[PDB]
Nucleic acid binder design. Structure first.
Ligand SMILES: Nc1ncnc2c1ncn2[C@@H]1O[C@H](CSCC[C@H](N)C(=O)O)[C@@H](O)[C@H]1O
Length: 353
DNA sequence: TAAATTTAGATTAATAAT
DNA sequence: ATTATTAATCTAAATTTA
């Protein structure tokens, strides 16, 4: 039977909403150690999440929209073997509505733009010609109290399609890097250093975790590991899970990071340094060159991996991909199985057989 | 030569309408 | 209920700036 997305997309329960569930039946092959956490986009081509679940011990995915955790939607799926009781959110939560997240937008927001939430944060922002086209479309009716509904359709559909916010007289501009940084739960300028360019900043932010959601999911580890954890971070990026564990005050004794982008690794090393992390950070580039024996040796040296967290590329799954949305076997999304390979190695030592 | 700026629809799920 | 519509969507790549 096909996997059907839950409506509402509250997963096993979100804060301030009904429907919390504290118990879950997990397959025996799914039991830890290690605890593992896999994330990807929910809106994939057909049959993708079924294959991911089949390769991850048949764990039914938890489908969560981060719009219950911040101002911007993020319909993601997470497969894990974590306990689902005693979850708690990191404090303080991000601003929930557009009115609170963008305090100056009052001055420019139109009454007919009835948006309360922003759409998903992607790696492609609206173009300046888009802002100028909306400005030119609405200027003729400046002296009129409200433009007729036929242009309202166009402008509202463009604002939703490109996730624009009102900043000037008739200016609907996309989000700025620090804006999506705060919305995605990262501290200010978390991705500003390391010689990363603005374009690379956008691409890395669009591809990242919403820290509050992942932290709500990972909070159950705090009572389990009083003296810190060993982390295997696959497809680390700008370090979503690391920031989440940092906000959860869960000591990260060791982090083996695997991330091919050098500016991403520099951002992770920066975050490690500016937060004065006591533990050790090890960085790897290509997961395809990470050998099974390297994983086994690292485990023997440090004592296994308490948690294996990652999100393989959603490249060939995202609906925004025009040319190469070929599914799980795409050149980049297929790296998912790489994840599964390293996970098995870890399991081979912690539970064995 | 790195950045930034354009230049490009399709696939499903959700919702409304038979 | 079967199905029309409405809607959301962690992008790729070819130019052009600077
Ligand atoms: N072959 C490979 N080996 C290691 N990492 C890879 C890879 N191919 C792609 N990646 C990386 O995998 C990442 C997935 S995006 C996940 C990062 C996000 N900040 C998060 O916290 O989850 C991308 O940053 C991409 O650069």
């Amino acid at each position: 039977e096909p996997i059907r997305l839950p409506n509402p997309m509250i997963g096993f329960g979100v804060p301030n909403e009904p429907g919390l569930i504290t118990h879950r039946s997990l397959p025996e092959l799914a039991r830890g150690p290690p605890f593992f956490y896999y994330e990807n986009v929910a809106l994939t081509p057909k049959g993708v999440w079924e294959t991911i679940s089949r390769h991850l011990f048949e764990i039914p995915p938890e489908f969560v929209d981060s719009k219950y955790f911040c101002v911007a939607a993020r319909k993601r799926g997470y497969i894990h073997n974590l306990p689902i009781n005693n979850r708690f959110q990191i404090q303080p939560p991000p601003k929930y509505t557009i009115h609170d997240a963008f305090p100056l937008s009052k001055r420019w927001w139109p009454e007919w733009d009835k948006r309360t939430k922003l759409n998903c944060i992607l790696t492609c922002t609206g173009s300046a010609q888009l802002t100028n086209r909306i400005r030119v479309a609405l200027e003729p009716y400046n002296e009129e109290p409200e433009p007729p509904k036929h242009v309202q359709r166009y402008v509202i559909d463009q604002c939703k399609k490109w996730n624009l916010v009102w900043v000037g007289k008739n200016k609907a501009a996309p989000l700025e890097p620090d804006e999506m940084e705060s919305i995605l739960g990262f501290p200010k300028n978390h991705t500003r250093g390391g010689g990363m360019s603005r374009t690379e900043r956008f691409k890395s932010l669009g591809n990242s975790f919403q820290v509050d959601t992942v932290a709500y999911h990972l909070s159950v580890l705090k009572p389990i590991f009083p003296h810190g954890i060993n982390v295997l971070s696959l497809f680390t990026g700008i370090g979503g899970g690391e920031v989440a564990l940092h906000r959860l005050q869960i000591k990260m004794k060791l982090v083996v990071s695997v991330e091919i982008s050098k500016v991403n690794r520099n951002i992770l090393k920066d975050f490690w340094e500016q937060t004065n992390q006591t533990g050790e950070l090890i960085e790897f580039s290509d997961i395809q060159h990470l050998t099974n024996d390297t994983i086994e040796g690292l485990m023997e040296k440090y004592g296994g991996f308490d948690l294996v967290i990652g999100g393989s590329p959603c490249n060939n799954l995202a609906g925004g991909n025009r040319v190469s949305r070929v599914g799980l076997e795409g050149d980049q999304s297929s790296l998912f199985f790489e994840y599964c390979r390293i996970l098995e190695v870890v399991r081979a030592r912690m539970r064995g057989s």
